[PDB]
Amino acid sequence: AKKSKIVKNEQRRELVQRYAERRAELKRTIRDPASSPERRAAAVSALQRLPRDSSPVRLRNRDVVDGRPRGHLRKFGLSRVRVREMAHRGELPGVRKASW
Amino acid sequence: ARLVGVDLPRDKRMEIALTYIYGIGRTRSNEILAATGIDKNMRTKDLTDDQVTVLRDYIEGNLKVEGDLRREVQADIRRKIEIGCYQGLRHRRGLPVRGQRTKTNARTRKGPKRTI
Amino acid sequence: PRSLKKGPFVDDHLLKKVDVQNEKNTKQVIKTWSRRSTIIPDFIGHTFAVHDGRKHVPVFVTEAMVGHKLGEFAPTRTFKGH
Amino acid sequence: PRKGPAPKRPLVNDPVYGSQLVTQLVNKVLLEGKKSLAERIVYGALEQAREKTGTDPVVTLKRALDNVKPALEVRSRRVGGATYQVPVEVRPDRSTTLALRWLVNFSRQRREKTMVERLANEILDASNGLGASVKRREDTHKMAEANRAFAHY
Amino acid sequence: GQKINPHGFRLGITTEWKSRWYADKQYKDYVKEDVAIRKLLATGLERAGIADVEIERTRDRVRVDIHTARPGIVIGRRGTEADRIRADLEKLTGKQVQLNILEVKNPESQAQLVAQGVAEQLSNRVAFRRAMRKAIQSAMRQPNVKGIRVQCSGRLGGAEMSRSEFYREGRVPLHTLRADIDYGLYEAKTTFGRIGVKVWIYKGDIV
Amino acid sequence: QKIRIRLKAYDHEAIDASARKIVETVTRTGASVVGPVPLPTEKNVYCVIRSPHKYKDSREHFEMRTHKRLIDILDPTPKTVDALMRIDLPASVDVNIQ
Amino acid sequence: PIQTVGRRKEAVVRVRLVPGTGQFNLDGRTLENYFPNKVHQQLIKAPLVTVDRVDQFDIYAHLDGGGPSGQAGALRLAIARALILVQPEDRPALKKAGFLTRDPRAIERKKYGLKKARKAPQYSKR
Amino acid sequence: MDVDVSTDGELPGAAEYAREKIGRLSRRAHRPVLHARVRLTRHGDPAVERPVIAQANLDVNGRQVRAQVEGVNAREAVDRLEARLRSRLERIAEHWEARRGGVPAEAGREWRHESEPARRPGYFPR
RNA sequence: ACUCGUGAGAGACUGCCGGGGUCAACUCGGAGGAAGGUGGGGAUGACGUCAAGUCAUCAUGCCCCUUAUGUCCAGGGCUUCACACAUGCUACAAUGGCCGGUACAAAGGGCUGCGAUGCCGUGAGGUGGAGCGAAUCCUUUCAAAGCCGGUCUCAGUUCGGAUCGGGGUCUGCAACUCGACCCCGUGAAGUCGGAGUCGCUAGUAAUCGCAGAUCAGCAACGCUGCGGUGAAUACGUUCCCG
Prior knowledge:
Helix content of chain G: 25-40%
Number of helices of chain E: 6
Strand content of chain E: 25-35%
Order of helices and strands of chain E: HEHEEHHEHHEEEE
Number of helices of chain G: 3
Strand content of chain G: 15-25%
Strand order of the largest sheet of chain G: 1-2-4-3
Number of domains of chain E: 2
Number of strands of chain E: 8
Largest interface: A-E, 19 and 25 residues
Oligomer: part of a larger assembly
CATH superfamily of the largest domain in chain E: Ribosomal protein S3, C-terminal domain
CATH class of chain G: Alpha Beta
């Protein structure tokens, strides 16, 4: 798509691995049990202070080379346009046209 | 039988007749009939006076129906209007308030179709 | 609506702003951008300039509008008729 | 049907009555593939008819069919760039089909609170010659006769 | 959209997959590294005709086999070309990557090489009729070639109007499944735009 | 004690070749085998649109088929096991040893 | 013993025939607890009727796949096959009735671009 | 006659002119018009000699009538579209006056596809 | 042993018989057979047409921007509504609604995912985590229409569920604009739809449920598949369309 947006997606992923791995997950563990004292702890407020880009909810599965944000397939990490072209060329092992 | 000022249907099973009360649906009628003990499927012309009394005092005790419910709902809508919230002006101009699409549908709030 | 276990959601920015505003008992116009923050009983007197998309519109809180969100009082789309 | 006639489906004889006609009737009343409900409706109507009259139900069903079976029908024909209502003779199979379809429909618009009752009343009056399907046969024969001038082509 | 890609039509019957490995959790990243390898090799080498690139993987070690019509060009006599490709394939996070450079036996019977040659001739100055005729004659001169069709389209000759032209010789049965149709597509770079050249070559059938 | 051998590959011929080769080596080492028990083929289907833009009604279907074979042996003498880690197989077929 | 199978559109029926009375054992349930539909029962017993060997064979059946109608059809085919295995010289009687033919009528595959196997989306010219 | 115009880009006053011109065609249609749509488009490329493209669709009692023209500006395209639509409506008429010359005439003179075949006796005339 | 799963193979070739046939193609009927005459359904789309669509998958000639038409961020918008068109879903009910009991599928998915037993809620759900990279465990042991029993009695109704009031759950940094779901209440239009028009020839139409991709959640009634129950009709090419 756009080079800047392809890059920014990756930057979100490295931000996610750096922050969402433990910082943005221990706060969730605090909020889960009503027994846990969340209200004074401000685990909500502390987790607000974290960057938005820490949250995986901001991620977007784009095509691994093409950058296409829609028509994505999780098995291949490829757009529907690219999967069709590489399967036809025999590039994805064990993939072929269907009949039944 | 005049129940809370509501003329009951001439011949209906009890819970569905009780549905005719403005504050009662099918769940409420079922549970109140179970709780106060009057049988659920007996017709509306078989009530005794004491049965009407027990329905009356129970409903007046642990339920709100008829005029009070209507005026409380009206008050809620009006208070929602006068604070200027989004639902407020949505009520003011007769448009759907729960995010429904208005490009094509929403004739229920818009009323009958008009040509212009 | 938000679940009760999590509690109401207020952004830290305007939360801190209102704590420092009410500690000396005068309410100046507070300029905010967080339409997603709900209204707390700590806002009863303060006047908020909530963002709209183009500008900030003054919102004076009362007892009734507690529990709502600031965005409910800053209408975004403008329609006058055809 | 451009390349010739198509084969017909040989539907089976009914088990509890042993007649082709009742299976044809159940397939006519069938809706959405609920065959069991259709069979229940037809069997109930036949039993109601047997109770009311007191004899075999298939014989009265056949009597009703003969009472509502048409013989002459009208089809629009375009000969020499002009269309007219031409009376045409009806083959036996099409007559049975028309009679059954008329019976089922006119029972569907009866007012007997249940399809089994409506069907039973319709078949009984058709047996006695008072049904609305009998009437419909009367008007179709009347229309075929009134256009007899066009039968020459 | 008229004709499906001939390789994909016979993928499970006549032709074979160009990538051989098995992955369940790591299918996606395997695919990513494979396409990265392919694009790297496509960009780096253009002089020698790169007819095909195969990738084989097994745990840590990665085996990449490529077929070229000029193996000496892509290989370093002291390994300099080999050193460069090895190092920048290690940099592709391939762990242990080893290369088997190969050579095609009949360059004129290979569709990809034929299309590459035709497009290269088209790019500089050559009239397209000359290129197609020369390619067709050279391919038909080979023993196993039973039929070749060459088609190129675009602003041929720098014209303002796009055109499609094709010549065929012999038999090219695209609808027959058992017949092996070698298909090659490659784009010619001209000053007036991009010209696409497609080649179909038919050499008997495999049963 | 017996150990399970599981084979999974996208090509039926290759998985059959691996199965027969494994049976051959284990019977060379003097072991009892249960044979290449077939297992249901796994089918993963994908449907895509042919054209880059619009033209939704034209779709293309692809599958990914996985064939599974089961090898079970007995009397695990150390020679058989050592032979088992010393078998070369096509990169297409993977082996699961349990 | 003798054992055959009947298949009818994703319904598979295994049958075990023994020369006892007319007892129908369908996975531990009788012909009445199973198949509570008279047409299905007639469809089941038709091969016996044409062979006139009713109430002289105890029948044990395994049912799996499909619905009641497919199960009944597969069971009828299984019974016909069992009869052809027991008394071969009755083959014309069963075959001319068609009970020896597997019905090759399966759910047609759904096609892309169409709502159903054949039903097409509504198209508006205006 | 009500017409809806779906233009695009820049075409000021094209919608009003197109509506006023097309709406005058209702009287020419011999059957009631159920719908009428017009689309105005312009070509981005300045090299195109006739950039503006006008299309129309009328539902004349279920019969679809459509036309398409090209022009150098909105007015010319709309006028040419009106001419084309009028020609199509003339050719569509299908009332009696429009099919009185095609109805087969005479008895033996002239032959047509729908002409009445001659009646022939069983025996050869001789 | 019988199913089944998956490898190999056999099996339909007008092969045979009788009749039409130019003794030619071809055609009609019969036997055998699971299947009979390209068995059923797929994949496969000639030269070209329509300067058809796509410079927004991608690539690219030329032109243009380059302290911006690049680039980062918050908020908003893409969801606006007097209307018009199009594709669908739900209904207008008794061949039905509600309640209780009860029987039969296929296909597919699952690792920081599926998630069971148990316990707590009325219910979304909460706690908890058995076992599962899975013909094993979970999706409940898998369905709904179906069958049996009871009730409703032709009414804008025990039909229909829109809209609206209040209260919650879950995901998520965050459900105001602008999510889904649950509970109580509310109970609109709608009585089978003009001109006109659409799909479908058999396991088809109609109807019933299940699954998948995308996906933190979902606007999914959409799309792609799977199985259950399963019709009517074709006289025949004058007319309409290609």
